[PDB]
Amino acid sequence: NATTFASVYAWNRTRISNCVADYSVLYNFAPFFAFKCYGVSPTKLNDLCFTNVYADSFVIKGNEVSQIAPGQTGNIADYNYKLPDDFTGCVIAWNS
Amino acid sequence: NATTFASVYAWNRTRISNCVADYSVLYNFAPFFAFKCYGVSPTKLNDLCFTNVYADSFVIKGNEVSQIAPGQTGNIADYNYKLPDDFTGCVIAWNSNKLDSKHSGNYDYWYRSLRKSKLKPFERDISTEIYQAGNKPCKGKGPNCYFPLQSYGFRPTYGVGHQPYRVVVLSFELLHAPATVCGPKKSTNLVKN
Amino acid sequence: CFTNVYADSFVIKGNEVSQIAPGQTGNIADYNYKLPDDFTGCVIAWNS
Amino acid sequence: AISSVLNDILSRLDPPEAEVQIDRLITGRLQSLQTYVTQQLIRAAEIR
Amino acid sequence: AISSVLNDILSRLDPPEAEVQIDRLITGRLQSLQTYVTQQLIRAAEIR
Numbered sequence: 224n225a226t227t228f229a230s231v232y233a234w235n236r237t238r239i240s241n242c243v244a245d246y247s248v249l250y251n252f253a254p255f256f257a258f259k260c261y262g263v264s265p266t267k268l269n270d271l272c273f274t275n276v277y278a279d280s281f282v283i284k285g286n287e288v289s290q291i292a293p294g295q296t297g298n299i300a301d302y303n304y305k306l307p308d309d310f311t312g313c314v315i316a317w318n319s
Numbered sequence: 320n321a322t323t324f325a326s327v328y329a330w331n332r333t334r335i336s337n338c339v340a341d342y343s344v345l346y347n348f349a350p351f352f353a354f355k356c357y358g359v360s361p362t363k364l365n366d367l368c369f370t371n372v373y374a375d376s377f378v379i380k381g382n383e384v385s386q387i388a389p390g391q392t393g394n395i396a397d398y399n400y401k402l403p404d405d406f407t408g409c410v411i412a413w414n415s416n417k418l419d420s421k422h423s424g425n426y427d428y429w430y431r432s433l434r435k436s437k438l439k440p441f442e443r444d445i446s447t448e449i450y451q452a453g454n455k456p457c458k459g460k461g462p463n464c465y466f467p468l469q470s471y472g473f474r475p476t477y478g479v480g481h482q483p484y485r486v487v488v489l490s491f492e493l494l495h496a497p498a499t500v501c502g503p504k505k506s507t508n509l510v511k512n
Numbered sequence: 513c514f515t516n517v518y519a520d521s522f523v524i525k526g527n528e529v530s531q532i533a534p535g536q537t538g539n540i541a542d543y544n545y546k547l548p549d550d551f552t553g554c555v556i557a558w559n560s
Numbered sequence: 561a562i563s564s565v566l567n568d569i570l571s572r573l574d575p576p577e578a579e580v581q582i583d584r585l586i587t588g589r590l591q592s593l594q595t596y597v598t599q600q601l602i603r604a605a606e607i608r
Numbered sequence: 609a610i611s612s613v614l615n616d617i618l619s620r621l622d623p624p625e626a627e628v629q630i631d632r633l634i635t636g637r638l639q640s641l642q643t644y645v646t647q648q649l650i651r652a653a654e655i656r
């Protein structure tokens with residue numbers, strides 16, 4: 224619910240740990256339109272546990288949404304935000 | 320060989336029976352990225368007799384080959400194609416970039432990602448009904464509703480670890496009386512006493 | 513301390529590198545170089 | 561083991577893989593034999 | 609085994625991997641039971 228979002232080339236990075244992650248609020252979010260998870264079941268997040276979680280927030284174009292995916296190619300992917308091939312996590316995107 | 324195999328959520332299945340099986344022909348294929356036989360030595364495959372063989376063909380991801388094994392984890396293993404814990408048969412996986420990849424994107428192959436519960440072993444789910452998250456009823460695309468089937472989006476430019484992999488599982492039931500598929504070994508005369 | 517050291521050296525395709533292992537299958541293993549069920553030693557493969 | 565018949569284990573598995581199943585059968589049958597012999601010794605002492 | 613609790617093995621490993629640990633527990637507890645019964649039989653002979 225941050226009022227201001229960082230740029231794609233300067234994507235805001237936050238670390239979250241030592242707390243309980245509630246995904247019910249994330250599910251209840253209405254304007255979400257692009258929810259893709261790789262390596263883990265999205266419905267099993269409430270049960271699976273991890274060490275730490277990293278949140279990277281930015282703003283891109285509508286057609287650039289598909290660029291944010293492992294193994295993808297593009298200007299945003301190559302020179303703005305690159306994901307590992309073995310990425311095990313989720314990506315959420317909503318209109319602004 | 321064929322020309323096209325269905326998607327994972329609707330894996331093609333055929334039965335082999337009332338014929339002599341010559342597994343040597345399998346060696347004709349070159350790549351053989353994965354050739355893993357559980358419960359039987361491949362070299363011994365020509366000497367036994369199987370009741371009825373079942374061939375299941377589909378196209379799995381580059382890194383999802385390892386999920387085709389008993390008791391495996393992941394969305395593919397327990398959402399689209401689940402092998403029994405007591406599986407007895409062979410698994411073959413070879414690359415298909417030159418045949419199953421489109422430059423604009425091969426979206427003809429789909430896999431299911433959202434479902435209420437994991438499947439039983441050797442169970443196929445072909446329904447494309449939407450998935451509901453929570454208790455709010457779903458009537459279409461929107462919050463808490465998503466299409467269970469997702470396209471692979473295969474592209475030849477992708478790496479080998481993300482290339483499409485043609486995967487075929489040969490599952491056979493061992494000697495339980497009515498053996499039909501038998502090896503190419505020739506019989507001999509019968510001697511008593 | 514090893515009684516006698518043997519070095520079998522050859523060149524193979526990269527995709528068949530994993531074929532050099534006891535009990536493995538493949539054209540290289542079946543018709544070129546096969547290791548026994550109780551092989552002891554090491555295998556070193558590097559790109560050339 | 562996969563089967564209780566040594567012939568069935570040997571006819572369907574390579575040596576290195578069949579070693580495990582044959583060994584499971586060996587361990588089980590040795591345990592059964594040892595149990596039989598111990599019970600027989602106790603019964604023999606009683607009958608003596 | 610990884611633990612002496614059946615449920616702890618159950619909710620930590622996949623079925624094929626948990627088979628080995630559960631079988632180790634089964635073998636250990638069967639050995640314990642066989643030892644107890646044999647000792648009871650010997651002591652019962654002495655008491656008889």
Ligand SMILES: *[C@@H]1O[C@H](CO)[C@@H](O[C@@H]2O[C@H](CO)[C@@H](O)[C@H](O)[C@H]2NC(C)=O)[C@H](O)[C@H]1NC(C)=O
Nearest residue numbers: 321322323324325329330331332333334374376
């Ligand atoms: C599995 O694929 C095979 C090979 O295509 C199918 O068997 C034949 O498929 C052709 C092409 O569709 C049909 O014309 C034949 O009639 C099929 N033969 C038989 C004996 O069925 C087979 O149908 C596929 N299995 C499934 C479940 O789709």
Ligand SMILES: *[C@@H]1O[C@H](CO)[C@@H](O)[C@H](O)[C@H]1NC(C)=O
Nearest residue numbers: 225229233234235236237280
């Ligand atoms: C992201 O934004 C938060 C909230 O303003 C801020 O505390 C944090 O330092 C930012 N992180 C980066 C890497 O800019």
Ligand SMILES: *[C@@H]1O[C@H](CO)[C@@H](O)[C@H](O)[C@H]1NC(C)=O
Nearest residue numbers: 320321322323344347348418
């Ligand atoms: C495999 O299929 C191709 C066409 O998809 C065909 O040209 C080729 O001969 C086939 N190989 C066989 C039948 O051995």
